[PDB]
């Protein structure tokens, strides 16, 4: 299960700079070991700050403030592929920001055969406004007349005596 | 001497021999009785509740 | 030996609580407190001799 970790890190003080800058990042990882490692990847990737010259000063797991209210989340990712340069924006409807990312990691792997290492989520933001939704399926999920038939569940107890009802 | 090795974490008699302190340990001691003050300032909450 | 064992257990409890109290104070004050790195590491070999 993924967890949203808030990681704050900075370079160690030296004679050149008395006080260093503080960098905070939000990223998703199963355990704090992965989050700290991914956080160091981004700073090197971005600020070109060495891990050996820096340290992690704060780590904190973040829980969903409103996990009982359905929301729509917009997610931006960067893709490393055969071309090695791509960027896409996707929308998901759920109750937990972490749940969107787990669902997000599912479709990239399903469609684009992508991996956890390649994807670097730039930003996740809740899209409260219905008009801001750019995806048709979410818009269909936002109508006041949501009522649809059941998707088939294809459910030892071998050798049933009677034909199953397989209906409502 | 020592024909067979006995685990102190299962044999209480061997544990009492090895550690002359298990007789008075008090593993569970109530610390937070009736105070439990929530210690998280608004500055920390704002930084945590970001993006 | 019994007195030494009790002192060690008292030291462990105080050292754990003070880490919690320091983190609680830093959290309330809004600053960041980084615990000290550990000097003890338990290493297990996972691959064989081939």
């Amino acid at each position: 299960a993924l967890k949203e970790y808030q990681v704050v890190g900075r370079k160690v003080p030296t004679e050149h700079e008395p006080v260093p800058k503080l960098f905070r990042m939000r990223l998703f990882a199963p355990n704090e070991s992965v989050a700290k490692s991914r956080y160091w990847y981004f700073l090197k990737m971005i600020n070109k700050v060495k891990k050996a010259t820096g340290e992690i000063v704060a780590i904190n797991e973040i829980s969903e403030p409103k996990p009982l209210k359905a929301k729509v989340f917009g997610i931006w990712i960067r893709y490393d592929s055969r071309s090695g340069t791509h960027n896409m924006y996707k929308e998901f409807r759920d109750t937990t920001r972490v749940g969107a990312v787990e669902a997000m990691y599912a479709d990239m792997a399903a469609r684009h055969r992508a991996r956890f290492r390649s994807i670097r989520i730039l930003k996740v933001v809740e899209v409260e406004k219905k008009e801001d939704v750019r995806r048709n399926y979410v818009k269909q999920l936002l109508n006041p007349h949501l009522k649809f038939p059941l998707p088939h569940r294809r459910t030892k107890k071998v050798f049933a005596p009677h034909r199953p009802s397989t209906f409502y | 001497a020592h024909v067979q090795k006995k685990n102190p974490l299962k044999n209480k008699a061997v544990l009492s021999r090895l550690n002359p302190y298990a007789k008075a340990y008090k593993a569970n001691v109530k610390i937070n009785s009736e105070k439990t003050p929530k210690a998280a300032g608004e500055k920390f909450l704002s930084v945590l509740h970001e993006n | 030996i019994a007195k030494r064992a009790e002192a060690y257990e008292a030291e462990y409890r105080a050292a754990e609580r003070e880490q919690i109290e320091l983190a609680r104070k830093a959290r309330a004050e809004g600053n960041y407190f980084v615990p000290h790195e550990p000097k003890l590491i338990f290493v297990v070999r996972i691959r064989g001799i081939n």
Binding site: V19, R24, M25, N87, K123 | - | -
Partner: peptide
């Protein structure tokens, strides 16, 4: 050793990867 990092005048800045 254990030490504190004051956040006064050194507020954290949120970082995002470059697109």
């Amino acid at each position: 050793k254990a030490h504190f990092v004051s956040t006064e005048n050194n507020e954290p800045v949120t970082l995002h990867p470059v697109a």
